[PDB]
Amino acid sequence: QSGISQTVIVGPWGAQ
Amino acid sequence: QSGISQTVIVGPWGAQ
Amino acid sequence: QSGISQTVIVGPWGA
Amino acid sequence: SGISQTVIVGPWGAQ
Amino acid sequence: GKAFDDGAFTGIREINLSYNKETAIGDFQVVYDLNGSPYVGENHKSFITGFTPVKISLDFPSEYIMEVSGYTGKVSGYVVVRSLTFKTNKKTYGPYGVTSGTPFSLPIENGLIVGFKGSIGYWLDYFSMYLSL
Amino acid sequence: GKAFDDGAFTGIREINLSYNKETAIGDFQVVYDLNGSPYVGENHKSFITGFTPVKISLDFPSEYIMEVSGYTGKVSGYVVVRSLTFKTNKKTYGPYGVTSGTPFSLPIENGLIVGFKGSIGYWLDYFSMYLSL
Amino acid sequence: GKAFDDGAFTGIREINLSYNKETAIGDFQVVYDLNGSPYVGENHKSFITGFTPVKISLDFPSEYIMEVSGYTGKVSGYVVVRSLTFKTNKKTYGPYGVTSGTPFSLPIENGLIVGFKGSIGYWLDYFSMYLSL
Amino acid sequence: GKAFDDGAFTGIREINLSYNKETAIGDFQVVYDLNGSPYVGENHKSFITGFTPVKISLDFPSEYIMEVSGYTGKVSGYVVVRSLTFKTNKKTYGPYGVTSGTPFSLPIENGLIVGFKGSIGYWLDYFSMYLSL
Ligand SMILES: OC[C@H]1O[C@@H](O)[C@H](O)[C@@H](O)[C@H]1O
Ligand SMILES: OC[C@H]1O[C@@H](O)[C@H](O)[C@@H](O)[C@H]1O
Ligand SMILES: OC[C@H]1O[C@@H](O)[C@H](O)[C@@H](O)[C@H]1O
């Protein structure tokens, strides 16, 4: 994997 | 607090 | 429920 | 992938 | 309506639902993944009949939901879920039901839907989703 | 617009934003919690001026993020976030901006908003939220 | 030996294991909690017999494992898990097996064991634990 | 000793420590990653001097800790952490301090160490680690 911690991300709301 | 695993929960959408 | 985010904590090792 | 994951500690024993 | 809570699993293999083009979403049931094997969740049934059945069979694990959207609106005075759309990295399933009322959308940039909870009377009153990495 | 990404922190202490009653959300800045101490996030500024500023100071940690809602719509040819409302376990902060176009809502049953990302040009083009237990 | 992997669940209700007071841990089996219901995990077995069975029945959900400790050592030229101890917030179960070789200890300040994986030949070669909030 | 708690971060860029072969770990300080930026954690210094300094610079983000191991033992009537070893997917850093006393090991199959807490008096009395996906 990688040394970067992950987090749930919701969205995007708006353009696209 | 207890031996029950937890999860992120989004909602509710709809009534209440 | 609290406004502070939580993380798994393992340990302590030592005293 | 569509499989959720979890923190895994170990292995303790034969490596 | 009758509340339900499937709880959390390791992914989604299939969503089985029912709708009526005049009213709202009826039945709702999910085949989850549980550690690489399917797990048939409880069938959450409407108190009434006359619904059009739909089977959303996912190409698990490479196909996963990236957005859940729909509409909430009044049907016979009740606030219910009138429509649902499931958007994956491979396909768009829906809309099922009536695209009338208040839109809602849950797009996901990182993480997975791993469970559903809600309530069903004549129609799907409300729902929530379990999210996990 | 100019994309921004604050990343993940341990909670929210304060949200600073600006809006215009004829257009949309302009500025966006967050004072996050970082392991018990305030952490002042970078100020994400609009390319233009003329906005009304608002400070949402939360009673951290007892007060927290239970719902974020708002509206997206067309402003001078662009699809942007026209309004925002932040609802806590104690109070409703908003609506700020123009409540016109298409609604969106993110209610939270379990977990917290721990970060923001998105893009700002003349207005807040879009945004996403980092969620954690 | 033969690798096993139970995957992840929502908690632990029972641990059924076997040991020999002169060798190491033999069989290993877990009754998990799966969203408020018992889920009987597969019984992972030694390729030999002569082990003493032990049932560690937990008062789920008020009772949960806070520490897993034990010993790894050489039995017939093979590095295996010779002993295991499970400390809950209510009681200490063990040591089961041989308190000889190299000790190990997994204390948990925050979070829960939600699954097991490992390998068993004549004895438990190794094991790992799934942790979750 | 003096209790410390750095809290949780996005990752680890550098570990600074000190040790003395006749005693134990003296110093402990971490340079974390906070959303892509190094974040210098507080220097948790021993009450005394005479330690050999150690800098463990990681090739973040490709290089990360897969195991923390060490030894606890009685030094001047106190149970302290006498030795530490950090193994990454690249190399083994350590042992730092003598490999004598009660060993401990925290190997990781999935997830990352995202923070440290503990206590330092004359030596590192104890420590815990924050783990996250
Ligand atoms: O679904 C709409 C409604 O259906 C009824 O049967 C039920 O009693 C109500 O509580 C509500 O759920
Ligand atoms: O905010 C609306 C727009 O503002 C402009 O300045 C920018 O060039 C566009 O890409 C868009 O962001
Ligand atoms: O590090 C070993 C010890 O160091 C002393 O100075 C302190 O008073 C003790 O509480 C313990 O921390």
Q: Give contacts of B7 with chain F, Cβ < 8 Å.
A: 110, 133
C9 is written with which tokens? Answer: 């904590």
Reduce the secondary structure of E56-100 to three states and give it as a string.
EECCCCCCCEEEEEEEEEEECCEEEEEEEEEEECCCEEEEEECCC
Burial (CB count within 10 angstroms: exposed 0-12, middle 13-18, buried 19+), residue F77? exposed
Question: How is chain E split into domains, by residue range?
Answer: 1-133
Contact F133 B9 (CB under 8 A): no
Best mutation target, H67, H81, H105, H117, to test chain G (most G CBs within 10 A):
H105
D7 is written with which tokens? Answer: 């923190």
**G78-88, strands of its sheet edge to edge:** G92-97, G78-88, G65-75, G102-110, C8-14, H124-132, H112-120, H2-5
Written as one string, the DSSP assignment of H38-84 is EEE---B--SS--PEEEEEE--TTT--EEEEEEEEEEETTEEEEEEE
- Pairwise CA distance, residues G99 & H108, whole Å: 24
Query: Helix (H, G, I), strand (E, B), or coil: what is residue H3?
Result: strand
Query: Across chain H, which distance is largest between two alpha carbons, in Å?
Result: 42
Strands (E), chain F: 2-5, 11-19, 25-34, 37-40, 52-57, 67-75, 78-87, 92-97, 102-110, 112-120, 124-132
Residues, chain G, total?
A: 133
Query: Helix (H, G, I), strand (E, B), or coil: what is residue G111?
Result: coil
Q: Give contacts of A8 with chain E, Cβ < 8 Å.
A: 108, 110-111, 131-133
CB F77 within 8 A of CB F63: no
- Pairwise CA distance, residues F11 & F61, whole Å: 8
Compute the nearest-CA separation of G73 from chain E (Å). 31
- Pairwise CA distance, residues G52 & D14, whole Å: 22
**Closest C-alpha residue for ligand 2 atom 9:** F1
- Measured CA to CA in angstroms, residue E77 lies from B15, B16, E23, E25, E44 at distances of 11, 13, 12, 15, 22
Contact H133 A6 (CB under 8 A): yes
End-to-end CA distance of chain F: 31
- Pairwise CA distance, residues G31 & G8, whole Å: 12
CB G104 within 8 A of CB G69: yes
Helices (H) and strands (E) in chain C, counts: 0, 1
Query: Helix (H, G, I), strand (E, B), or coil: what is residue H102?
Result: strand
Q: How many CB atoms lie within 10 A of CB H99?
A: 13
- Pairwise CA distance, residues D6 & H132, whole Å: 9
Q: Which residues share a beta bridge with E15?
A: E30, E56
Q: Which residues share a beta bridge with F55?
A: F16
> Is C7 in CB contact (< 8 Å) with chain G?
yes
Query: Helix (H, G, I), strand (E, B), or coil: what is residue F38?
Result: strand
Rama region for F47: left / alpha / beta (φ>0; ψ in -120 to 50; rest): alpha
- Pairwise CA distance, residues E94 & G19, whole Å: 55
- Pairwise CA distance, residues G81 & G104, whole Å: 10
**Closest C-alpha residue for ligand 3 atom 5:** H121
Tell me which amino acid residue G121 is. G
Q: Choose among G98, F34, E11, D15: nearest CA to H10.
A: F34
F40 is written with which tokens? Answer: 């002042």
CB H25 within 8 A of CB H52: no
CB F20 within 8 A of CB F53: no
Q: Which of F104, F105, F131 sits opposite E131 (nearest CB)?
A: F131
Arch. (CATH architecture) of H1-133: Aligned Prism (2.100)
> Is D4 in CB contact (< 8 Å) with chain H?
no
CB E82 within 8 A of CB E71: yes
Bridge-based pairing state of the strands E102-110 and E65-75: antiparallel
Query: Nearest ligand to the C-alpha of residue C15?
Result: 3
> Is C2 in CB contact (< 8 Å) with chain G?
no
Q: Choose among C3, G38, B15, F131: nearest CA to E130.
A: F131
Q: How many CB atoms lie within 10 A of CB G40?
A: 13
- Pairwise CA distance, residues D13 & G104, whole Å: 9
Query: Helix (H, G, I), strand (E, B), or coil: what is residue G73?
Result: strand
E strand or H helix at G72: strand G65-75
F8 is written with which tokens? Answer: 């993940």
Bridge-based pairing state of the strands C8-14 and E92-97: unpaired
Whether residue H107 is preceded by a cis peptide bond, meaning omega within 30 degrees of 0, is no
Specified resolution (Å): 2.0
Instruction: Please tell me what DSSP assigns to residue G45.
Output: -
